Design a protein around this ligand. Structure first.
Ligand SMILES: [Mg+2]
Length: 134
DNA sequence: CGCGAATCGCG
DNA sequence: CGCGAATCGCG
């Protein structure tokens, strides 16, 4: 399996798990940052990876782009394909924002179609995903 | 730590 | 029992 350079890659920057969550999507070839979500005060890394893929799908759909999305999160990929984020994070006032975003991203998936292939980034073969926060 | 995938205990 | 609830492998 080979890298598709004409693609978008996403990843999450965490400060703890659970902890602060941010994410971004970048051009796999050029590294150009295409979208970014500012820090969400608490979430899980998995929830962040899920939001990052869905944000990518919405971004690419708006632009009518047929580029695939790479994610290094097998869990988030499954959640998007299932249209269901199977997170165990407690729902309270502290976690209200991350859950609002996850709920909305699920709602988007259940009310839209998309052509974007969602591919697993193979870190062990290809090194770090381009959206890595380092 | 959170996930998906892969031994227990109660009815 | 045997099925549904309750450690492994990884990132
Ligand atoms: Mg990540």
């Amino acid at each position: 399996e080979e890298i598709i350079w004409e693609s978008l890659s996403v990843d999450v920057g965490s400060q703890g798990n659970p902890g602060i969550v941010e994410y971004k999507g970048v051009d796999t070839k050029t590294g150009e940052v295409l979208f970014e979500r500012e820090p969400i005060p608490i979430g899980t890394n998995n929830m962040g990876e899920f939001l990052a893929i869905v944000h990518g799908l919405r971004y690419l759909k708006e632009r009518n782009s047929r580029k695939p999305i790479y994610s290094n999160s097998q869990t988030a990929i499954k959640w998007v394909k299932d249209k269901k984020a199977k997170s165990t994070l407690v729902r309270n006032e502290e976690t209200a924002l991350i859950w609002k975003l996850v709920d909305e991203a699920e709602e988007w998936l259940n009310t839209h179609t998309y052509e974007t292939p969602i591919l697993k980034w193979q870190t062990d073969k290809w090194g770090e995903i381009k959206a890595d926060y380092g």
